[PDB]
Amino acid sequence: XXXXXXXXXXXXXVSLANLKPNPGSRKPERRPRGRRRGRKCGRGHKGERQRGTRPRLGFEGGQTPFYLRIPKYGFNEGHSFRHQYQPLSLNRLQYLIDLGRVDPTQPIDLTQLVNGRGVTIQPSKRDYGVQLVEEGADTFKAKVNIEVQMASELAIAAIEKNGGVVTTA
Amino acid sequence: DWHLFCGDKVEILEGKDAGKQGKVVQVIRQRNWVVVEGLNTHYRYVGKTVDYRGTMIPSEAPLLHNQVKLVDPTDRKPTDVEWRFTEAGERVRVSTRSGRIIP
Amino acid sequence: XXXXXXXXXXXXXXXXXXXGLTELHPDVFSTAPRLDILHQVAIWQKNFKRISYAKTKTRAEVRGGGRKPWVQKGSGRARHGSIRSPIWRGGGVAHGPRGPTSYYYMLPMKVRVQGLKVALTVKLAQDDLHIVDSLELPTADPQYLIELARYRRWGDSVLLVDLEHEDMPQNVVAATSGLKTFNLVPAVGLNVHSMLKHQTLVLTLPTVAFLEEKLXXXXXXXXX
RNA sequence: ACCAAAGCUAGCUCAACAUAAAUAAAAUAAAACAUUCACCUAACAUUAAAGUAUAGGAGAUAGAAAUUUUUAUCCUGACGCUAUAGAGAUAGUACCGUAAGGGAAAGAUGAAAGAAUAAAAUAAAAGUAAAAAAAAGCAAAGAUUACCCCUUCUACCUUUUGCAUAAUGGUUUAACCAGAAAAAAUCUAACAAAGAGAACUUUAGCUAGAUACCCCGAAACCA
Numbered sequence: 269x270x271x272x273x274x275x276x277x278x279x280x281x282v283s284l285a286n287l288k289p290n291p292g293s294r295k296p297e298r299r300p301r302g303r304r305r306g307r308k309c310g311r312g313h314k315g316e317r318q319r320g321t322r323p324r325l326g327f328e329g330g331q332t333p334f335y336l337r338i339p340k341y342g343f344n345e346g347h348s349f350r351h352q353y354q355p356l357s358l359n360r361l362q363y364l365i366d367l368g369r370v371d372p373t374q375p376i377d378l379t380q381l382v383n384g385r386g387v388t389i390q391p392s393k394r395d396y397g398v399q400l401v402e403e404g405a406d407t408f409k410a411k412v413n414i415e416v417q418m419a420s421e422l423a424i425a426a427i428e429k430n431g432g433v434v435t436t437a
Numbered sequence: 438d439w440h441l442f443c444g445d446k447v448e449i450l451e452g453k454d455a456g457k458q459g460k461v462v463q464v465i466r467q468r469n470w471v472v473v474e475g476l477n478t479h480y481r482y483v484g485k486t487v488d489y490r491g492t493m494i495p496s497e498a499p500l501l502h503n504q505v506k507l508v509d510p511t512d513r514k515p516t517d518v519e520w521r522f523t524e525a526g527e528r529v530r531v532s533t534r535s536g537r538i539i540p
Numbered sequence: 541x542x543x544x545x546x547x548x549x550x551x552x553x554x555x556x557x558x559x560g561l562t563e564l565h566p567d568v569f570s571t572a573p574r575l576d577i578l579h580q581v582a583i584w585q586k587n588f589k590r591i592s593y594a595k596t597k598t599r600a601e602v603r604g605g606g607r608k609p610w611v612q613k614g615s616g617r618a619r620h621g622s623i624r625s626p627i628w629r630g631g632g633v634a635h636g637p638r639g640p641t642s643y644y645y646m647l648p649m650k651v652r653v654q655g656l657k658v659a660l661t662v663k664l665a666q667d668d669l670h671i672v673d674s675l676e677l678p679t680a681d682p683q684y685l686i687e688l689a690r691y692r693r694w695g696d697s698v699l700l701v702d703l704e705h706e707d708m709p710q711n712v713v714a715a716t717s718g719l720k721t722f723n724l725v726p727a728v729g730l731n732v733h734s735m736l737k738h739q740t741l742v743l744t745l746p747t748v749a750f751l752e753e754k755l756x757x758x759x760x761x762x763x764x
Numbered sequence: 765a766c767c768a769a770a771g772c773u774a775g776c777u778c779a780a781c782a783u784a785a786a787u788a789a790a791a792u793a794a795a796a797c798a799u800u801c802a803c804c805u806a807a808c809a810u811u812a813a814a815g816u817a818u819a820g821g822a823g824a825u826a827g828a829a830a831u832u833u834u835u836a837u838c839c840u841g842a843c844g845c846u847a848u849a850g851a852g853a854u855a856g857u858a859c860c861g862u863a864a865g866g867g868a869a870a871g872a873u874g875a876a877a878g879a880a881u882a883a884a885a886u887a888a889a890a891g892u893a894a895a896a897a898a899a900a901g902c903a904a905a906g907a908u909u910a911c912c913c914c915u916u917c918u919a920c921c922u923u924u925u926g927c928a929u930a931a932u933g934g935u936u937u938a939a940c941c942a943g944a945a946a947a948a949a950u951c952u953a954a955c956a957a958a959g960a961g962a963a964c965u966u967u968a969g970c971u972a973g974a975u976a977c978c979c980c981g982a983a984a985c986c987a
Contacts, residue, residue, distance in 0.1 A: 392812095
């Protein structure tokens with residue numbers, strides 16, 4: 269409809285001078301010069317806020333800081349040495365089956381799952397395992413072999429129930 | 438590779454004096470100009486105070502070399518300069534039309 | 541499915557012939573051309589070509605010394621530090637260009653691709669786009685090209701994209717020699733900047749082939 | 765019309781390419797200060813690991829490694845700037861200091877002197893041109909005459925609860941001169957369970973663009 273309306277009328281051939289952005293595309297950057305905000309450039313009257321020497325962030329003004337009054341726990345200790353495992357839903361799998369991806373047993377593997385853009389990249393995860401958390405598994409398609417590091421009980425259950433094969437490495 | 442030298446008969450293709458022919462008195466490479474005999478007449482003042490007699494004399498003002506062209510000794514027509522080596526084993530400048538040696 | 545049918549007029553370019561027929565199906569066409577995308581592509585193309593050679597000297601980079609010109613108090617003059625200060629006429633500027641940079645940026649592939657696509661659509665529907673089977677320039681002289689552009693009533697500025705750059709000397713020699721009106725460029729070197737630079741586009745059959753192949757493969761890669 | 769402005773050209777910045785010996789500190793940041801401090805002296809390429817593993821008055825801050833990914837020449841200049849800009853430089857001269865050292869200012873007629881061609885002659889300053897009938901004025905406006913008296917009004921700026929204030933800054937004019945950082949977010953577009961040029965994110969996200977945090981000044985310390 270817009271193609272016919274654009275082709276019907278004869279325009280200026282759209283020279284480079286006729287190029288214009290959509291409304292609200294680029295902001296009209298504010299310049300401190302003017303009588304709008306006088307002489308303080310929005311920094312207010314005096315104080316240390318006016319100066320560029322103003323105090324650093326994370327400072328409560330000399331009173332005991334917030335983070336210093338908080339006890340310690342091993343929450344951060346985990347993110348270092350934790351053994352990484354990624355859960356995968358059976359819904360995603362049956363979705364891959366419904367997307368017309370590779371059917372047969374033999375070629376199926378994690379590599380093929382990588383090529384299908386259905387995998388999560390784990391560059392910062394050392395000793396990466398693969399796990400399956402059950403979901404969307406109701407009346408899912410049958411005769412599909414899956415090879416994973418460690419599969420959950422309900423995953424192996426769901427897969428074997430419909431005739432699938434669970435390969436544990 | 439230079440164009441005009443002192444003493445040759447030259448022609449002028451541009452200006453009020455265009456079309457006239459004459460020899461060159463002096464060539465200055467500083468301001469890049471030439472002076473043709475009895476051409477571009479201008480006023481000059483040589484006075485005598487003691488004798489009370491002032492004397493105004495006509496003189497030739499320097500003209501741009503780009504408006505001046507050399508004249509071939511044979512063809513006699515104005516022409517551009519070209520650098521060649523004759524059969525006599527010499528480095529010379531000749532007309533772009535004929536083979537007459539300018540030097 | 542709406543199929544756009546474009547008529548390709550074959551010109552033997554000798555003279556006095558507008559007659560030719562080829563049925564083309566440019567699926568590359570788009571309903572509404574994006575002005576925003578085109579503008580962003582143009583701005584970007586203008587941006588990565590910036591040399592950013594602008595330079596100055598901050599007060600620290602000034603050859604002048606840092607000695608105090610006089611005592612702080614008792615002199616009767618104003619308080620002053622080194623004479624290389626920006627408040628001094630012998631000093632530089634603090635906010636100046638002196639610190640270098642790079643004005644370019646990385647634009648997503650789909651954006652620039654859709655940019656060239658939309659631009660091609662613009663040139664298409666503007667009637668300024670013509671398709672030919674081949675190109676012939678037997679005489680190979682400026683006068684022939686000029687009188688051809690005047691007789692056939694082409695645009696004021698025509699961008700010719702034909703050759704694969706590997707052949708046909710007779711055309712290129714005359715086309716690339718002293719011509720302001722017409723511009724030359726290989727089929728694999730076709731860009732949006734070149735198209736937007738000219739008011740008229742003329743493509744040949746192989747050029748249209750490779751172009752529609754590249755654009756269909758990029759549209760299919762962007763849709764998937 | 766007077767002192768005067770206005771008319772050009774040297775000149776350079778930066779990128780790329782070619783080619784007779786011996787652990788330096790401290791000021792400062794942690795709004796004090798004492799352990800501590802990216803940085804600087806010489807060797808130290810890209811992507812990602814990663815602002816992670818750790819270290820630290822476990823305060824400020826400091827901060828890898830294992831490992832990963834990478835690529836052949838040939839193609840030159842300006843969305844850099846002109847006498848207050850760009851180097852200070854028509855020069856390290858003149859000049860200052862015993863010395864080390866510090867460090868300036870400074871050219872324009874015309875194509876040709878062939879010396880009356882030019883074209884404006886308005887910046888602050890005095891000349892052509894002073895106040896003018898017994899009248900008051902932060903310096904004008906409304907009336908009024910082609911001028912004035914009368915009537916109506918407490919300089920600017922800064923700092924402050926509040927300044928015409930006898931609080932601050934300014935002889936005047938010209939010129940120079942002080943808000944350059946995107947994480948999360950709002951917004952404009954690309955695609956969408958995927959985005960993004962082999963790097964990350966992701967129970968509508970992802971990518972790109974566009975939006976907010978200015979200068980001058982010590983007394984002193986160290987080498």
